[PDB]
Amino acid sequence: GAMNSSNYAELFNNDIKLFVDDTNVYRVTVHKTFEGNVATKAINGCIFTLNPKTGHLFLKIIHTSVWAGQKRLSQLAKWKTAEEVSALVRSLPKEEQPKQIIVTRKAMLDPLEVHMLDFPNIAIRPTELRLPFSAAMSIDKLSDVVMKATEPQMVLFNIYDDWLDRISSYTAFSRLTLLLRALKTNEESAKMILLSDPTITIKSYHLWPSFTDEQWITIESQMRDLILTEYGRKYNV
Amino acid sequence: MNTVPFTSAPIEVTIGIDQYSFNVKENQPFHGIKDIPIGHVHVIHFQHADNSSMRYGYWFDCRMGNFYIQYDPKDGLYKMMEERDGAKFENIVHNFKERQMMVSYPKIDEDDTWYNLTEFVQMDKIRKIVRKDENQFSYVDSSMTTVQENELSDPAHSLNYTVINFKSREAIRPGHEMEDFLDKSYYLNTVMLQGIFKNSSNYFGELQFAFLNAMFFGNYGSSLQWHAMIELICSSATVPKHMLDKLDEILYYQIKTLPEQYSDILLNERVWNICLYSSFQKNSLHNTEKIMENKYPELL
Numbered sequence: 001g002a003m004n005s006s007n008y009a010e011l012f013n014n015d016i017k018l019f020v021d022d023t024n025v026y027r028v029t030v031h032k033t034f035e036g037n038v039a040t041k042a043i044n045g046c047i048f049t050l051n052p053k054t055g056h057l058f059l060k061i062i063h064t065s066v067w068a069g070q071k072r073l074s075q076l077a078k079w080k081t082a083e084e085v086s087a088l089v090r091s092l093p094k095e096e097q098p099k100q101i102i103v104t105r106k107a108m109l110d111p112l113e114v115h116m117l118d119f120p121n122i123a124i125r126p127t128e129l130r131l132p133f134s135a136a137m138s139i140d141k142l143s144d145v146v147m148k149a150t151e152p153q154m155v156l157f158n159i160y161d162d163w164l165d166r167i168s169s170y171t172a173f174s175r176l177t178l179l180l181r182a183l184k185t186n187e188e189s190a191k192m193i194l195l196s197d198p199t200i201t202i203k204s205y206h207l208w209p210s211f212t213d214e215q216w217i218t219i220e221s222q223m224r225d226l227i228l229t230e231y232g233r234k235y236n237v
Numbered sequence: 238m239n240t241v242p243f244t245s246a247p248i249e250v251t252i253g254i255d256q257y258s259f260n261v262k263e264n265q266p267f268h269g270i271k272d273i274p275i276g277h278v279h280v281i282h283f284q285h286a287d288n289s290s291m292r293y294g295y296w297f298d299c300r301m302g303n304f305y306i307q308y309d310p311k312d313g314l315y316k317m318m319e320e321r322d323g324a325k326f327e328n329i330v331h332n333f334k335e336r337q338m339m340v341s342y343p344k345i346d347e348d349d350t351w352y353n354l355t356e357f358v359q360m361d362k363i364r365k366i367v368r369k370d371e372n373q374f375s376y377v378d379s380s381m382t383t384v385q386e387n388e389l390s391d392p393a394h395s396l397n398y399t400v401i402n403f404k405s406r407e408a409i410r411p412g413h414e415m416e417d418f419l420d421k422s423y424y425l426n427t428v429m430l431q432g433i434f435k436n437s438s439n440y441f442g443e444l445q446f447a448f449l450n451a452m453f454f455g456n457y458g459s460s461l462q463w464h465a466m467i468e469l470i471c472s473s474a475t476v477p478k479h480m481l482d483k484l485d486e487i488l489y490y491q492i493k494t495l496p497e498q499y500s501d502i503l504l505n506e507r508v509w510n511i512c513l514y515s516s517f518q519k520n521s522l523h524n525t526e527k528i529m530e531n532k533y534p535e536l537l
Contacts, residue, residue: 076415079414079415082414083414110404111415113404114404114409114414114415115414117406
């Protein structure tokens with residue numbers, strides 16, 4: 001059923017699973033029209049489909065053309081997300097197909113379940129975890145490929161760079177969620193922390209800087225402190 | 238007018254005939270029910286005074302044979318049985334009638350309630366939902382499960398209602414996932430009406446039969462079927478005008494007849510709120526909405 005704190009270790013076992021986050025599929029800027037009414041302009045979006053064990057990210061770019069002449073776009077966005085996830089599973093070899101798909105928002109359950117009728121043995125699960133995957137568009141290289149897309153496109157990343165050479169997927173996932181939580185709370189501060197020392201670079205084939213084990217401990221501490229600071233502001237505590 | 242004679246009444250029981258009921262005391266000289274209107278299915282039903290558990294009963298049509306009730310002290314229930322000897326039967330009934338040991342189906346002349354609740358219900362269709370081919374009458378009770386309930390345990394004692402499942406390959410055409418899920422018109426009109434029921438009459442017949450089994454026996458699976466068949470129509474954007482007009486009349490009489498004290502367990506809040514207020518047909522059930530609002534405004 002629902003994924004939470006109690007069954008956390010299950011994310012890192014050997015059963016293939018994917019997280020799906022639909023929060024950046026339908027993206028708009030709200031603006032004033034010449035007559036002083038309000039209008040939206042859509043921008044390129046993305047489905048964020050992540051294997052939490054391996055770091056493999058299936059970033060399906062949603063081009064603005066998919067909304068052209070459609071009504072009830074916030075509803076369509078859930079169905080288009082389910083259609084694309086379904087097409088991705090069918091495109092994978094059998095032994096690569098997930099046994100579970102966890103949706104980060106409960107509104108995805110019915111759309112994904114109706115699109116995956118052909119896969120009755122794939123479990124569609126919600127989560128009680130508050131995951132920060134909305135902040136994926138705060139990762140410069142992911143944001144760049146989405147905004148430059150001129151057509152629908154699938155781009156394959158490893159969101160953990162080479163971390164699994166040195167740490168477990170449990171620790172890699174904890175690092176990723178803390179980075180994304182920081183980027184989501186204070187994007188400017190988070191990004192300042194990640195580039196503060198210009199000697200540490202992002203390899204062409206990576207998303208994050210090349211921190212040594214010791215520099216990661218420092219960065220992780222700075223991210224935690226950023227999250228408490230911001231918290232003792234929202235709430236004044 | 239036709240008669241269901243009783244051999245005897247050895248155990249204290251509440252006897253139902255359609256929407257009417259009488260208390261019979263242990264060994265009371267009760268020998269049955271006369272003046273039963275020809276032209277409708279009927280249900281004769283039972284709730285033992287000493288164990289209110291298992292309401293049970295028989296669906297029958299007097300045009301299809303001569304039927305009587307006899308208590309079986311082994312299986313501990315009132316059983317329906319067919320008398321094949323026409324002359325023996327007429328002679329039993331005549332004796333009991335002359336001795337006035339029979340209650341009169343208490344039909345008020347202006348009252349169309351039973352016709353309105355059974356307008357599309359046919360014995361032949363009942364006998365396909367309740368399979369026991371050696372009898373012309375059909376046993377139902379409180380605890381019998383539906384084919385669909387068993388899928389999710391004795392197959393011969395099942396209610397074989399048409400399976401409706403909004404998240405099934407049957408309900409959802411490949412490449413029309415969102416369309417078919419949010420607008421069930423193809424599932425209602427092509428799969429169910431044209432495909433399985435053949436016409437709206439058979440569809441309404443099953444819907445009405447499901448309601449009556451829910452109401453008379455507290456059969457939980459029948460209640461689920463009645464709601465599903467309502468929701469499939471209300472969730473369809475395209476429904477023939479005559480079907481919507483008929484549905485309003487059918488539900489009106491069902492809601493009117495429901496015991497007031499049973500609306501808590503028999504009516505599904507989600508389905509009704511959705512059907513009356515949110516669905517495509519939210520504006521097509523005037524009669525049903527007016528009675529629901531005036532009789533069960535807590536539910537909404």
